[PDB]
Design an enzyme around this catalytic site. Structure first.
Site, PDB file in Angstrom:
ATOM      1  N   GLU A 158       0.820  -1.214   0.000  1.00  0.00           N
ATOM      2  CA  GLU A 158       0.000   0.000   0.000  1.00  0.00           C
ATOM      3  C   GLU A 158       0.871   1.290   0.000  1.00  0.00           C
ATOM      4  OE1 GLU A 158      -3.033   0.259  -0.511  1.00  0.00           O
ATOM      5  OE2 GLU A 158      -3.905  -1.712  -0.072  1.00  0.00           O
TER       6      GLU A 158
ATOM      7  N   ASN B  27      -8.938   5.162   3.166  1.00  0.00           N
ATOM      8  CA  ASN B  27      -9.636   6.001   2.184  1.00  0.00           C
ATOM      9  C   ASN B  27     -10.616   7.000   2.834  1.00  0.00           C
ATOM     10  OD1 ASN B  27     -11.199   6.743  -0.145  1.00  0.00           O
ATOM     11  ND2 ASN B  27     -11.491   4.687  -0.932  1.00  0.00           N
TER      12      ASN B  27
ATOM     13  N   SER C  20     -11.820  10.734  -3.848  1.00  0.00           N
ATOM     14  CA  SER C  20     -11.342  10.464  -2.455  1.00  0.00           C
ATOM     15  C   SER C  20      -9.798  10.289  -2.512  1.00  0.00           C
ATOM     16  CB  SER C  20     -12.013   9.152  -1.913  1.00  0.00           C
ATOM     17  OG  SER C  20     -11.631   8.044  -2.759  1.00  0.00           O
TER      18      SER C  20
ATOM     19  N   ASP D 195      -6.398   8.205  -0.384  1.00  0.00           N
ATOM     20  CA  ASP D 195      -5.959   7.168   0.554  1.00  0.00           C
ATOM     21  C   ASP D 195      -4.696   7.728   1.335  1.00  0.00           C
ATOM     22  OD1 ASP D 195      -7.856   5.435  -0.594  1.00  0.00           O
ATOM     23  OD2 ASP D 195      -6.283   4.173  -1.470  1.00  0.00           O
TER      24      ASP D 195
HETATM   25 CL   LIG Z   1      -9.799  13.522  -1.335  1.00  0.00          CL
END
Ligand SMILES: [Cl-]
Ligand SMILES: [Cl-]
Ligand SMILES: [Cl-]
Ligand SMILES: [Cl-]
Ligand SMILES: [Cl-]
Ligand SMILES: [Cl-]
Ligand SMILES: [Cl-]
Ligand SMILES: [Cl-]
Length: 128
Positions: free
Chosen positions: A35, A59, A50, A52
């Protein structure tokens, strides 16, 4: 902060993440590797707008507030900036909520695509 492999395993264990929800420590280290490359300050924008955040790429569509994800929730009750700190406590607390949400670690699509089913104990091999 960019953690080393065993340094992050040790911090995850000290925050209760080992065997949480049945997921051994290697699963959590593997997920962090893919990640964020173990970087607490990692951020990545998603196509939906969005973002992360942090070493587990939590998120803003669901879990944290960043003020710029319209229609999104804040189910961890935390500013997304809290998820970029050198101390991983806020990311671990929010990961515990996520992994309890119904689909386990499949919530992290890098875990599902790169870690699930593999020899995840190699990620903690050698660590004290
Ligand atoms: Cl965002
Ligand atoms: Cl590594
Ligand atoms: Cl393991
Ligand atoms: Cl982080
Ligand atoms: Cl928002
Ligand atoms: Cl909104
Ligand atoms: Cl820490
Ligand atoms: Cl992936």
């Amino acid at each position: 902060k960019v953690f080393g492999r065993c340094e992050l395993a040790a911090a995850m264990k000290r925050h209760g993440l080992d065997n949480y929800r049945g997921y051994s420590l290697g699963n959590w280290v593997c997920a962090a590797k893919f990640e964020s490359n173990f970087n607490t300050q990692a951020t990545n924008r998603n196509t939906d707008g969005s973002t992360d955040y942090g070493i587990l790429q939590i998120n803003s569509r669901w879990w944290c507030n960043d003020g710029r994800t319209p229609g999104s929730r804040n189910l961890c009750n935390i500013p997304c900036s809290a998820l970029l700190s050198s101390d991983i406590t806020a990311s671990v607390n929010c990961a515990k909520k996520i992994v309890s949400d119904g689909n386990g670690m499949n919530a992290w699509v890098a875990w599902r695509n790169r870690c699930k089913g593999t020899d995840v104990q190699a990620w903690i091999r050698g660590c004290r």
